[PDB]
Amino acid sequence: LIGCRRAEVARTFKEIQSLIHVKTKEFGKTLNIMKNILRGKSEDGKIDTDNMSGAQNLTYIPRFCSHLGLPMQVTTSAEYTAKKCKEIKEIAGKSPITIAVVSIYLNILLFQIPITAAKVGQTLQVTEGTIKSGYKILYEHRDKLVDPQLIANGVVSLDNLPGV
């Protein structure tokens, strides 16, 4: 996990857990210990940048979109939505995985790709209820979650996003 993060190609805890069979508690405690060790030998003996921070959600979006087979235009829109999604306090505390998945789902229905949430959550191993629950929060601020140029050109209109 540290090695992936240092290379700017960071992965998620679940993705690494798919190969190495270790439950979450031991994983977290070991990671905290090793980070302290690296920091300790960075001062006495660099190590981290803006990347070392846990969330760094923008890095996950390109791979998650690839798993769904979306075009690059949707991926860029998802990155913009996820980047601006941190201004909302009702969602900012959520896990970076959900922040990226809900942003991807918002754009999937914005460009009208026929992929249902039942498969988006099944592909990225995220509960469908969580996806739709988060989508509701990412509906009161849609004007701030869509790139101005895309709406200006005419590629996407905000009336294609269903409203509850």
């Binding site: 998620t12 805890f13 979450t24 977290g28 990671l31 905290n32 980070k35 920091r39 981290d48 803006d50 070392m52 921070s53 846990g54 969330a55 201004e87 306090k89 900012a92 505390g93 959520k94 896990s95 970076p96 995985i97």
Partner: protein, 181 residues
């Protein structure tokens, strides 16, 4: 400066009696006792007036928890010892030390966790896909703070009521520096 004092929520105090107990006897003759040796090696007992729980071990050691005040824990521990006395066992109130105090509060404004995790990297650990709260390990006093986006702070690790106040007064400035919007 802050004007807000954190409120204590739990006090884990340990007491000794200097005598060996028979846990089965305590479980059968105590009002609210739950002795299951297969899982744990103590009889779990509760009382209602201070609302505290006690883990009474076979070596005469007691672990009272749940009290909201330093003195309330003493009253709870004393009553637990008295209950053991009324059973017949040789039980005397003895060394009472508070081993942990937990306090909670709220600064009343959102906090950018990504900031503390970056500016303060030698103390703070922020892994938000495991726990939604940042973990700040203050070095003096040695107390652990759980900082959340909603602006709620949890203080745990203090052994007296002074350290928990001292920690918060030392963490308010760095928390205010990272106020979102």
């Amino acid at each position: 400066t802050s004007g807000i004092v954190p409120t204590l929520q739990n006090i884990v105090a340990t007491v000794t009696l200097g005598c060996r107990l028979d846990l089965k006897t305590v479980a059968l003759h105590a009002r609210n006792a739950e002795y299951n040796p297969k899982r744990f090696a103590a009889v779990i007992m509760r009382i209602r007036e201070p609302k505290t729980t006690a883990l009474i071990f076979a070596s005469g050691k007691m672990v009272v928890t749940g009290a909201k005040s330093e003195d309330d824990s003493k009253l709870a521990s004393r009553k637990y010892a008295r209950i053991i006395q009324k059973i017949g066992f040789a039980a005397k109130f003895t060394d009472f030390k508070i081993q942990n105090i937990v306090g909670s509060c709220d600064v009343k404004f959102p906090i950018r966790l990504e900031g503390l995790a970056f500016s303060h990297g030698t103390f703070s650990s922020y892994e938000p896909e495991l726990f939604p709260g940042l973990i700040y390990r203050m070095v003096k006093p040695k107390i652990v703070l759980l900082i959340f986006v909603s602006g709620k702070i949890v203080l745990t690790g203090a052994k007296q009521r002074e350290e928990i106040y001292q920690a918060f007064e030392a963490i308010y400035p760095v928390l205010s520096e990272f106020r979102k919007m």
